[PDB]
């Protein structure tokens, strides 16, 4: 039996974590969740103990912690703090067309590998003189090599064919250029993989017109935020796609688009699919593959039934009715 940290988070986090527990119970998953909560308190005591708990269990499942962007800059995003403190340097999401969720595009099958600790997320800003603010985007060779190594290894191991580095090196010549150059260094050791690059602006334009051209995509932190959300939207929205955050020893699983869903919480309408799929990825990571597969196929099969769809994907069903159908299909 494995002990896993569970951070309920805000908005729809708590309610969806209850359904993960119900599914895990019915499936007799040998996993015990050890819950840590993170308040809105300016004090980092909460976020600090959640880190210590993940350092101990090594594996976590989390909802999104709300960030109040009206608070002073000293009050930092708790999600970013946790990401960076545990050095979970790879954010990985898999956006794939679901035959039961028909959108404007089909045949999409994209693995996005996003540098998850650096870049525009470094929390370095200052006001030299009043009304003049500088924010410091940091790109390093060590972290860009690291994420590029991850993307090419993932491409090779899952049998993919192309890695596209997404960047703005035409304007940020030194920073995005370094990131691009680190991708190129790694590409030289994976001659069986096609390496291409594309400017982030053109990438969005190609995603809304021919997203089928993309295979594996690797990019620094903010561009990954953009491409993750574009790709998630293309395949049916934030209720569907799971995300993973990997470091060398730790791993935290969540929904791909990292949304709180405050405006739909406690209404029994949130789509549980992405949270459930995240909990299966965590099960695979724990080498509990037979459980992961039982739950995932039930979850995926439920998607083929439009009667089970929640409103975010054009349906009318409640969360609990979706969970009921998932549990009925775990046998």
């Amino acid at each position: 039996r494995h002990t896993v940290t569970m951070i309920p988070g805000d908005g729809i986090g708590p309610e969806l974590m209850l359904h993960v527990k119900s599914v895990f119970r019915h499936a007799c998953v040998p996993v015990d969740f050890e819950e840590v909560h993170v308040s809105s308190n300016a004090d980092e005591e909460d976020i600090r103990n959640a880190i210590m708990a993940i350092r101990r269990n090594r594996v976590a499942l989390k909802g999104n912690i709300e960030t109040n962007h009206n608070l002073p800059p000293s009050h930092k995003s708790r999600n970013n703090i946790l990401r960076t403190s545990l050095d979970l340097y790879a954010n990985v999401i898999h956006c794939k067309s679901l035959p039961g969720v028909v959108t404007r595009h089909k045949d999409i099958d994209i693995l996005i590998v996003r540098e998850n600790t650096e870049g525009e997320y470094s929390s370095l800003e200052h006001e030299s003189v009043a009304g003049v603010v500088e924010s410091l985007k940091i790109i390093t060779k060590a972290k860009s090599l690291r994420i590029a190594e991850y993307a090419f290894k993932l491409a090779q191991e899952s049998g993919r064919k192309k890695v596209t580095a997404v960047h703005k090196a035409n304007i940020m010549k030194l920073g995005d250029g370094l990131f691009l150059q680190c991708c190129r260094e790694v590409a030289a050791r994976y001659p069986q993989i096609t390496f291409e690059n594309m400017i982030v602006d053109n990438t969005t334009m190609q995603l809304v017109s021919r997203p089928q051209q993309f295979d594996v995509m690797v990019m620094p932190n903010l561009y990954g935020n953009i491409v993750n959300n574009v790709c998630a939207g293309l395949v049916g929205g934030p209720g569907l796609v799971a995300g993973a955050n990997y470091g060398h020893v730790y791993a935290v699983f969540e929904t791909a688009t990292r949304n709180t869903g405050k405006s739909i919480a406690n209404k029994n309408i949130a789509n549980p699919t992405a949270t459930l799929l995240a909990s299966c990825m965590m099960l695979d990571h724990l080498k509990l593959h037979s459980y992961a597969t039982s739950i995932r196929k039930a979850v995926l099969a439920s998607m083929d039934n439009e009667n089970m769809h929640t409103p975010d994907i054009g349906g009318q069903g409640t969360t609990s009715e979706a969970i009921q159908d998932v549990i009925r299909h775990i046998r």
Partner: protein, 325 residues
């Protein structure tokens, strides 16, 4: 009856600027063209170019070949506001049919400050610059654009959760301009959520105001929703009443003289140009004759579907704009 500074540019540039002139003529637009060449010399644009533009204050620019000149022109005229209205086009079918968004992009600072440092070997710092001055400036333009174009809603697009001090200041100045312009309804949304929602239901968006890099990306995303850079108009607003409206597609050298170009985009930037001055009816008629041409589908250029030459496309707009009140 004022005159514009025309910059035909290179490759297919002349062709489509010819096409736009013939159509403005068939509409009897109080507009004749003062052709001028901008090229990096000495670094600067030629004196005969800066003089026409300071005189007429209105320019129409086609595609240039590849210091960046749109950087040069921006600093030379203080082009602080990039504006890209994107409207789905009847007859040019994309999976997005209800798009009507104007991205309004701060064009001077933000992530494009030009300042990077190698801090130590293998460690690079790129400076994002947000100033209270330029932020207020682009917010006031956004709200002013909304009024004069009968736009109901403005959204500030930001990442102030992650970049609190910089994006937060941008937000704070958007907020102030909002509370003095309550006839336009103001809201705020995270850049990633805008992106997430945009590709699902773009009809929910009206006017989007945001700092430089977000505007750079989102304006291209939106243009991808309606068909591409071949059809999308663009305008840049500068200091002392200058404004340059432009193609944003390539020069297309591979078809540069073969009379196959699509002039739609430069034309709609010219329509946009007219509306900026105030010759609304000429704009409305040229626009309508263009939209009706593509809707008709008989005279589609090879990039928009059919196998019609560029001047057969231009002529049909000519015929249809002569027969419209």
């Amino acid at each position: 009856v004022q005159t514009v500074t025309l910059i035909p540019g290179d490759g297919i540039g002349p062709e489509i600027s010819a096409a736009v002139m013939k159509i403005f003529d068939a509409a009897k637009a109080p507009i004749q063209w003062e052709e001028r060449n901008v090229t990096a010399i000495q670094w600067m644009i030629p004196s005969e170019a800066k003089e026409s533009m300071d005189k007429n204050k209105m320019g129409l620019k086609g595609p240039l070949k590849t210091p960046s000149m749109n950087l040069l022109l921006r600093k030379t005229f203080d082009l602080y506001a990039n504006v890209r209205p994107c409207v789905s086009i009847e007859g040019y079918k994309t999976p997005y049919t209800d798009v009507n968004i104007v991205t309004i992009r701060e064009n001077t600072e933000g992530e494009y400050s030009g300042i990077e440092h190698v801090i130590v070997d293998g460690v690079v710092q790129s400076i994002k610059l947000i100033t209270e001055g330029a932020s207020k400036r682009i917010a006031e333009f956004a709200f002013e654009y909304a009024r004069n174009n009968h736009r109901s809603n403005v959204t500030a697009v930001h990442k102030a959760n992650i970049m609190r001090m910089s994006d937060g200041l941008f937000l704070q100045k958007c907020r102030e301009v909002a509370e003095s312009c309550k006839d336009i309804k103001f809201n705020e949304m995270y850049l990633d959520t805008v992106c997430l929602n945009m590709v699902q239901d773009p009809s929910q968006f009206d006017v989007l105001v945001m700092p430089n890099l977000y505007g750079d990306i989102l304006s291209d995303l939106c243009a991808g929703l309606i068909g591409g850079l071949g059809v999308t108009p663009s305008g840049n607003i500068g200091a002392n009443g200058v404004a340059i409206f432009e193609s944003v597609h390539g020069t297309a050298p591979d078809i540069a003289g073969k009379d196959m170009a699509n002039p739609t985009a430069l034309l709609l930037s010219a329509v946009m140009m007219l509306r900026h001055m105030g010759l609304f009816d000429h704009a409305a008629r040229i626009e309508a004759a263009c939209f009706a041409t593509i809707k008709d589908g008989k005279s589609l250029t090879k990039d928009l579907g059919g196998n019609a030459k560029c001047s057969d496309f231009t002529e049909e707009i000519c015929r249809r704009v002569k027969d419209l009140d």
